Design a protein around this ligand. Structure first.
Ligand code: HEM
Ligand code: HEM
Ligand code: HEM
Ligand code: HEM
Lengths: 146, 141, 146, 141
């Protein structure tokens, strides 16, 4: 219903070259820069006064590592995305109160980061594969909301 | 932009709303929380039960702000300046949610205005709520 | 997806009062008046120049009747919307070239029509049930696009 | 609104595109048709095959329009008047599709401008494309 075998292979191969902590810190930082309203959950993270401040903020980087690490572990279960992220869905809805729209935006920022990081290697077909992935992850994270 | 005909339709429709604006405001919020659960993520500090005084109070402010917007339809950005500041820098509601509430406000008006909610008025009201939304998210970045 | 039993009862009970032919014409006509761009799929329907012309256009009323009739039949298969609309999904994509985003707008317009026609009886909980339904039908109708 | 920094950021990044206008435009279109298939419903009779002259030609028109907008960032509504008439009255592309194309254009620029695509420029380019999209859908209703 989503990824074809060639698409899964493409996602897996590219991801095998990703510095998860690095991409995570960068995607979260970019999310907070490009869509500043997402800063609302991180006032306790300190300085987010400018883009350089956000990107250089240690707590923003720390959080991006956590977020992308859980995203990365989920790429090993592209056949059970809803189940894989169920407990994080409940958590984000029941305790964190994070609007699922934020997952969709982070998803697209991740795609822009991957395109910036990999250049031409991030071909249109590879992008389409990753678009299904970020949409699936975002849908799975939003599934337990009530 | 809001045409002379749209502004006329809006004023007439909201004029019939009259003193019920606040009650309709709270109903629109209730409709929103039940129809689009994710919108509740912005009010974890609220009792969101049917009849809730917190929802009634918030509904009253939302309605009053729109009444003020209707009264300044030709000079809307300034009338809503303080609310734009507030939503852009404190509340930080993702833009998509304004579309959910606008839709629930339309549904609320439709359920209460059998005579005035004609296709033309529906169109004008939708444009009006979209412009209010645009204004309220105009300082986001 | 996944209406509760109370929602299912609410959906069925309200629909027993709907004049499918008329409500369909009203919803399709409003979709064309409120979101004018949707008129480009009805190039051959005649006069759509003004709201009154759209709402009184017989081909619009007739088509609204067919459209809502298919939605109506789907109400009998709420647990299998995708399978139920697979054939029409393909038709709408391969032959009609209709952007599925319009299915979502029509669903919202139908909700406004039910609210306008039924008034107070279209309570917040009944609305919520119908919101689930219309998104499910829109999703099912967009499912076979490629 | 596009701030002075946004405009500076946009002019510099887009300036870098230069001669690759039609190439980047075609690639953004291909990225959209592949990632978001529903967008192909607006090009039902187009030869959408990889490297097709039709997509290359349309990509170039799209990028030249963007170049025109950047050159007149201070007054886009006027600079894109004909284009907004066309999209509003003839093409009638549902508004959501502009977000899809804008995202693919951003992805395209990211993949081709390693040096220039900083977080700040990323934000400015996103604001710019949203602003162009708003202008192109301003006469819809
Ligand atoms: C790919 C999407 C995402 C994944 C997989 C993810 C994953 C995680 C994980 C693994 C945690 C740790 C929770 C714990 O320690 O029990 C977490 C916490 C959190 N997440 Fe998410 N998340 C995602 C996106 C987001 C976004 C977009 C936001 C909001 C902009 C967000 C806001 C939070 C917050 C506020 C916390 C609490 C952190 C703290 O208390 O220090 N998350 N997330
Ligand atoms: C028609 C669009 C809207 C209007 C006219 C509006 C207006 C307002 C007003 C007048 C207030 C009170 C300001 C004050 O106390 O100083 C307010 C507060 C707030 N609004 Fe908005 N609003 C709109 C849409 C939204 C949406 C879509 C959401 C999120 C779903 C949202 C969430 C809130 C929140 C969380 C508060 C704080 C409530 C409290 O703590 O009492 N608003 N809004
Ligand atoms: C609840 C969603 C919808 C349902 C269930 C539905 C159902 C149908 C059905 C049953 C037909 C009859 C086909 C035939 O007899 O050959 C059809 C045709 C058609 N539909 Fe849909 N439809 C939906 C929404 C829409 C939307 C929103 C648009 C466009 C904005 C659209 C545009 C059309 C067009 C252009 C035709 C062909 C009309 C003609 O030339 O006769 N439909 N649809
Ligand atoms: C950044 C946004 C966009 C820009 C700058 C843009 C620009 C243009 C221009 C310059 C033309 C050529 C007009 C002429 O021949 O004089 C055009 C045509 C067209 N556009 Fe847009 N456009 C945008 C987005 C969209 C979107 C999102 C869609 C649909 C998914 C779309 C679909 C079309 C179609 C179908 C045509 C007609 C092509 C043909 O028949 O040759 N456009 N656009």
């Amino acid at each position: 219903v989503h990824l074809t075998p060639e698409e899964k292979s493409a996602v897996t191969a590219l991801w095998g070259k990703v510095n998860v902590d690095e991409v995570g810190g960068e995607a979260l930082g970019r999310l907070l820069v490009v869509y500043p309203w997402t800063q609302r959950f991180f006032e306790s993270f300190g300085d987010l006064s400018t883009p350089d401040a956000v990107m250089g903020n240690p707590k923003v980087k720390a959080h991006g590592k956590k977020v992308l690490g859980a995203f990365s572990d989920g790429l090993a279960h592209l056949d059970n995305l809803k189940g894989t992220f169920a407990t994080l869905s409940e958590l984000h809805c029941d305790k964190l109160h994070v609007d699922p729209e934020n997952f969709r935006l982070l998803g697209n920022v991740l795609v822009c980061v991957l395109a910036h990081h990999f250049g031409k290697e991030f071909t249109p077909p590879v992008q389409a594969a990753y678009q299904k992935v970020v949409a699936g992850v975002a849908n799975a994270l939003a599934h337990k909301y009530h | 932009v809001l045409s002379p005909a749209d502004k006329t339709n809006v004023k007439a429709a909201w004029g019939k709303v009259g003193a019920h604006a606040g009650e309709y405001g709270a109903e629109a919020l209730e409709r929103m929380f039940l129809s689009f659960p994710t919108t509740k993520t912005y009010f974890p500090h609220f009792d969101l039960s049917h009849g809730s005084a917190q929802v009634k109070g918030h509904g009253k402010k939302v309605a009053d702000a729109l009444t003020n917007a209707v009264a300044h339809v030709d000079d809307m950005p300034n009338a809503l300046s303080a609310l734009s500041d507030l939503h852009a820098h404190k509340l930080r509601v993702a833009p998509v949610n304004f579309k959910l509430l606008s839709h629930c406000l339309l549904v609320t008006l439709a359920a209460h205005l059998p005579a005035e909610f004609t296709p033309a008025v529906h169109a004008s009201l939708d444009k009006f709520l979209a412009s209010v939304s645009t204004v309220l998210t105009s300082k986001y970045r």
